[PDB]
Enzyme design. Structure first.
Site, short mmCIF file in Angstrom:
data_model
loop_
_atom_site.label_atom_id
_atom_site.label_comp_id
_atom_site.label_asym_id
_atom_site.label_seq_id
_atom_site.Cartn_x
_atom_site.Cartn_y
_atom_site.Cartn_z
N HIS A 128 47.35 7.38 10.61
CA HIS A 128 48.25 8.51 10.85
C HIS A 128 49.67 8.12 11.22
O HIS A 128 50.52 8.98 11.38
CB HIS A 128 47.68 9.56 11.80
CG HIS A 128 47.58 9.10 13.24
ND1 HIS A 128 46.39 8.68 13.78
CD2 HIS A 128 48.45 9.17 14.28
CE1 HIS A 128 46.58 8.34 15.04
NE2 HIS A 128 47.80 8.69 15.39
N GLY B 169 51.61 9.23 22.31
CA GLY B 169 52.11 7.83 22.09
C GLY B 169 51.04 6.81 22.34
O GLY B 169 51.24 5.60 22.15
N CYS C 17 48.17 6.61 20.67
CA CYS C 17 47.31 6.34 19.55
C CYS C 17 47.50 4.87 19.26
O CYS C 17 48.55 4.35 19.55
CB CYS C 17 47.62 7.26 18.37
SG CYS C 17 49.45 7.76 18.28
C1 LIG Z 1 49.33 9.77 18.33
C2 LIG Z 1 48.77 10.02 19.74
O1 LIG Z 1 49.43 9.74 20.76
N1 LIG Z 1 47.62 10.71 19.84
C3 LIG Z 1 46.88 10.65 21.10
C4 LIG Z 1 46.94 12.03 21.72
C5 LIG Z 1 46.28 11.98 23.06
N2 LIG Z 1 46.78 12.63 24.10
O2 LIG Z 1 45.29 11.26 23.13
N3 LIG Z 1 47.04 11.32 18.63
C6 LIG Z 1 47.45 12.52 18.23
O3 LIG Z 1 48.22 13.14 18.93
C7 LIG Z 1 46.98 13.12 16.92
C8 LIG Z 1 48.06 12.90 15.87
C9 LIG Z 1 47.52 13.09 14.46
C10 LIG Z 1 46.30 12.52 14.08
C11 LIG Z 1 45.89 12.67 12.73
C12 LIG Z 1 46.69 13.34 11.80
C13 LIG Z 1 47.92 13.85 12.16
C14 LIG Z 1 48.34 13.72 13.49
N4 LIG Z 1 46.77 14.55 17.09
C15 LIG Z 1 46.00 14.97 18.04
O4 LIG Z 1 45.43 14.11 18.74
C16 LIG Z 1 45.77 16.44 18.17
C17 LIG Z 1 46.13 17.03 19.53
C18 LIG Z 1 47.50 16.63 20.05
C19 LIG Z 1 47.47 16.65 21.59
C20 LIG Z 1 48.48 17.70 19.55
N5 LIG Z 1 44.32 16.65 18.00
C21 LIG Z 1 43.76 17.55 17.17
O5 LIG Z 1 44.44 18.29 16.44
O6 LIG Z 1 42.31 17.65 17.21
C22 LIG Z 1 41.82 18.60 16.26
C23 LIG Z 1 42.09 20.06 16.62
C24 LIG Z 1 41.19 20.75 17.45
C25 LIG Z 1 41.43 22.10 17.74
C26 LIG Z 1 42.55 22.76 17.20
C27 LIG Z 1 43.45 22.06 16.37
C28 LIG Z 1 43.23 20.70 16.09
C29 LIG Z 1 50.84 10.06 18.37
O7 LIG Z 1 50.88 11.45 18.65
C30 LIG Z 1 51.47 9.89 16.98
O8 LIG Z 1 52.12 8.92 16.62
O9 LIG Z 1 51.27 10.96 16.05
C31 LIG Z 1 51.70 10.60 14.72
C32 LIG Z 1 50.91 11.60 13.89
#
Ligand SMILES: *[C@@H](C(=O)N(CCC(N)=O)NC(=O)[C@H](Cc1ccccc1)NC(=O)[C@H](CC(C)C)NC(=O)OCc1ccccc1)[C@H](O)C(=O)OCC
Ligand SMILES: *[C@@H](C(=O)N(CCC(N)=O)NC(=O)[C@H](Cc1ccccc1)NC(=O)[C@H](CC(C)C)NC(=O)OCc1ccccc1)[C@H](O)C(=O)OCC
Lengths: 306, 306
Positions: B41, B143, B145
């Site tokens: 991602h 941040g 991930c």
């Molecule tokens: C990546 C990062 O820091 N994280 C860790 C977040 C955390 N607090 O652990 N990862 C992400 O934020 C995901 C980014 C992403 C992954 C795949 C495709 C596109 C984007 N997104 C999520 O984790 C997201 C929630 C965030 C808090 C907004 N999760 C979901 O959407 O889960 C599914 C869902 C469930 C219910 C309703 C809707 C969705 C860091 O953010 C980065 O570099 O991102 C680049 C994409």
């Protein structure tokens, strides 16, 4: 999201750990620049652990009485001195891996990371708080003396604890890196006991803010309290008194969550008085007192989940 | 004495952490030999997080589309490929600090250490268990991930988790170091939820042995149980069934403490049925399920405090 006790990453302190041997005793030391620091009880013998006289045990020691081992390498000892309850051994070599560091004397209620080591070899890391009764609730077996506690800000390691003793209740006692104990304890196997401990009020309140910042409001109430009235109830439950300083420390958290500190106290005073029973707060029943307001700010989001 | 959740010392994994940037996205990666591993991602854009097609997003990328930053140094990318939900970037350089390592796929109920990193910079370490519903109850902000989970035996790091997503209940999801998720989750922002979780029976029993090894016997009783009868009560309380394998795993602890596993089950079945209410076990109310029998053996004394 989530809230976990967490330690500082331990690598800068792993590159400082060595093994110090005096006779048949081996324990851990901490090599920073050209000096190794370790508990002076490395010079005790089996037959006198009750009343060692260290000044007299030491004058019988030379530089070649100590072996310092860093990895597979032997460090030559080139001078030694005692400082309070520690020895400072000068070695041949300056440790290439010394980080920026300071020595600091942590204050009760503060938290730090312990790196548990045996024979100079790090085996685990965990967070703990300096209790009000000056011991820590650590997890340590024989050979852990010399293991250190520390905090890290930016690139700088602030060392705050070196392990020395376990007390009968299974809690732990030790010193700062100048070798001054925390609490009234002494480095001899004579009867000593932890004094009665108390719960750390400031931390419990911090952790109620973290629960709110993370999204939980269940324990709140429509009531407020006087510092003084709160403290009456704290005595009854064995909590430290809350002072205006503690209240001011909690300002930032109060501001981020919009709940006044004295409203959070009334909520705590109701948890104390009515129990939790049935419900947890951040995964816990039992009001948790091992996170500082600084540890909650470090770890929580800066944006409240309103 | 003492019993604390503890993480493995994190230094060998700190020397592996880097920052990977693709466009305006920055996240953590893991540099081992000449390869950097990170969540794919990193190649998503703001406007398509719902249905990215990675194979198609990647064919539009070149080697100079990725910047890899190790400390103040820039690593040149010299090849890239995708593997499941990770990218493997070949860099110019082999990391001088690569430890012995393996990649392994941890199994539910097992535990590992997480090193939380932001922008390639380690900020904290904590222990957590792979839950039966394949998520972990971590503590991670934006941040994080690319942050990794690992265990260490001797000099060898066994990497087991790379962080990817947070789910609505504030729990976390991610993959092994071959990029295969744990659980049914997928790396896109489409609705997903953790399935219902269950308590990890094997761990709760282990932690009852650790409490006994440390010196507490209060929760014991004069009764025994059938595996099958125990499992009936487990269902009712939402515990995983206990299998004969689990029972065999607990042999060493049973032997050190002299309490038969099925006698410990009857004690658990009485804790479940009668509550704890008033008393703690190793500092806890709530039966704790995040320590393995291996974690209890690693950390407790080998000699029971009888
Ligand atoms: C990546 C990062 O820091 N994280 C860790 C977040 C955390 N607090 O652990 N990862 C992400 O934020 C995901 C980014 C992403 C992954 C795949 C495709 C596109 C984007 N997104 C999520 O984790 C997201 C929630 C965030 C808090 C907004 N999760 C979901 O959407 O889960 C599914 C869902 C469930 C219910 C309703 C809707 C969705 C860091 O953010 C980065 O570099 O991102 C680049 C994409
Ligand atoms: C040093 C070491 O590993 N530890 C850590 C022990 C632990 N589990 O944390 N330190 C010691 O064992 C102390 C050794 C000592 C210190 C000063 C002078 C002489 C010896 N001793 C203790 O910690 C001891 C308990 C041990 C578990 C036996 N504590 C006390 O005696 O406390 C006072 C007391 C209270 C009540 C009754 C009697 C005494 C490692 O063991 C080593 O190298 O030892 C060299 C001396």
């Amino acid at each position: 999201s989530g809230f976990r006790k967490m330690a500082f990453p331990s690598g800068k302190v792993e590159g400082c750990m060595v093994q110090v041997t005096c006779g048949t005793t081996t324990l851990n030391g901490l090599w920073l620049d050209d000096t190794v620091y370790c508990p002076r009880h490395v010079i005790c013998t089996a037959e006198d652990m009750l009343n060692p006289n260290y000044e007299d045990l030491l004058i019988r020691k030379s530089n070649h009485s100590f072996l310092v081992q860093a990895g597979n390498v032997q460090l030559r000892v080139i001078g030694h001195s005692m400082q309070n309850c520690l020895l400072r051994l000068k070695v041949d070599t300056s440790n290439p891996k010394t980080p920026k560091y300071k020595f600091v004397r942590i204050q009760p209620g503060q938290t730090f990371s312990v790196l548990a080591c045996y024979n100079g070899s790090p085996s685990g890391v965990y967070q703990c708080a300096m209790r009000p009764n000056h011991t820590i609730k650590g997890s340590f077996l024989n050979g852990s003396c010399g293991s250190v506690g520390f905090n890290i800000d930016y690139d700088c390691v602030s060392f705050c604890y070196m392990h020395h003793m376990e007390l009968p209740t299974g809690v732990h006692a030790g010193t700062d890196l100048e070798g001054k104990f925390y609490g009234p304890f002494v480095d001899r196997q004579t009867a000593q006991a932890a004094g009665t401990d108390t719960t750390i009020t400031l931390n419990v309140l911090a952790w109620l803010y973290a629960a709110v910042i993370n999204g939980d409001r269940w324990f709140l109430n429509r009531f407020t309290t006087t510092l003084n009235d709160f403290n009456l109830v704290a005595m009854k439950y064995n909590y430290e008194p809350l002072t205006q300083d503690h209240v001011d420390i909690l300002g930032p958290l109060s501001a981020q969550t919009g709940i006044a500190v004295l409203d959070m106290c009334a909520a705590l005073k109701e948890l104390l008085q009515n129990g939790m029973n049935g419900r947890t707060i951040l995964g816990s029943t039992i009001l948790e007192d091992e996170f500082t307001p600084f540890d909650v700010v470090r770890q929580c989001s800066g944006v409240t989940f309103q």
